[PDB]
Design a protein around this ligand. Structure first.
Ligand SMILES: C[C@@H]1CN(C(=O)c2cnsn2)[C@@H](C)CO1
Ligand SMILES: [Cl-]
Length: 163
């Protein structure tokens, strides 16, 4: 575990993370995809061997000894708000199980079911709160990666307000 488990946020490419493992915002078919998924594919393509997994699940594949946790959030274009919410919370629960199993002291994590899976809605708060619900019982240092300047501020405020 980390001596004083923390949450942090950085605005940069998660492929340049300084953590012991990464969470990919994966598609269910293990395809290179776009956005975070494509950056992850470029950096750790070996981690896409048999990475396909259903919505609401996480599947870890090693790139060397570096664990890539492929977490499949729902595409809110396809799911109802109710069913998508349930699957999004489930994907993060599976990430917490994998982070725990791996014994890492840190993890780099993107906000699942944002961007191309958001169904054109702002899901920062929904996705971040499911992240916290799953990760709060873990003792890994969590570093959230984002790309938007306004999202960085909102995530940073949400972290700071619970300390
Ligand atoms: C891709 C990231 C996250 N994001 C969203 O998910 C989104 C989608 N519809 S409203 N907001 C926007 C802030 C753009 O930057
Ligand atoms: Cl960058």
């Amino acid at each position: 575990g980390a001596m004083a488990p923390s949450y942090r946020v950085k605005r940069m490419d998660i492929a340049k993370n300084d953590e012991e493992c990464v969470v990919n915002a994966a598609n269910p078919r293990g395809l290179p995809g776009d956005g975070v998924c494509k950056a992850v594919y470029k950096k750790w393509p070996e981690s896409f061997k048999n990475s396909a997994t259903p919505v609401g699940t996480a599947k870890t594949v090693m790139c060397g000894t570096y664990p890539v946790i492929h977490a499949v959030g729902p595409n809110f274009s396809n799911y109802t708000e109710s069913e998508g919410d349930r699957e999004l919370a489930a994907a993060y629960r599976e990430v917490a199980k994998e982070v725990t199993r791996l014994g890492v002291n840190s993890v780099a994590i993107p906000l699942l079911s944002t961007g191309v899976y958001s169904g054109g809605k702002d899901r920062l708060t929904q996705s971040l709160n499911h992240l916290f619900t799953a990760m709060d019982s873990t003792d890994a240092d969590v570093v959230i990666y984002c790309r938007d300047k306004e999202w960085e501020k909102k995530i940073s405020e949400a972290i700071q307000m619970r300390t």
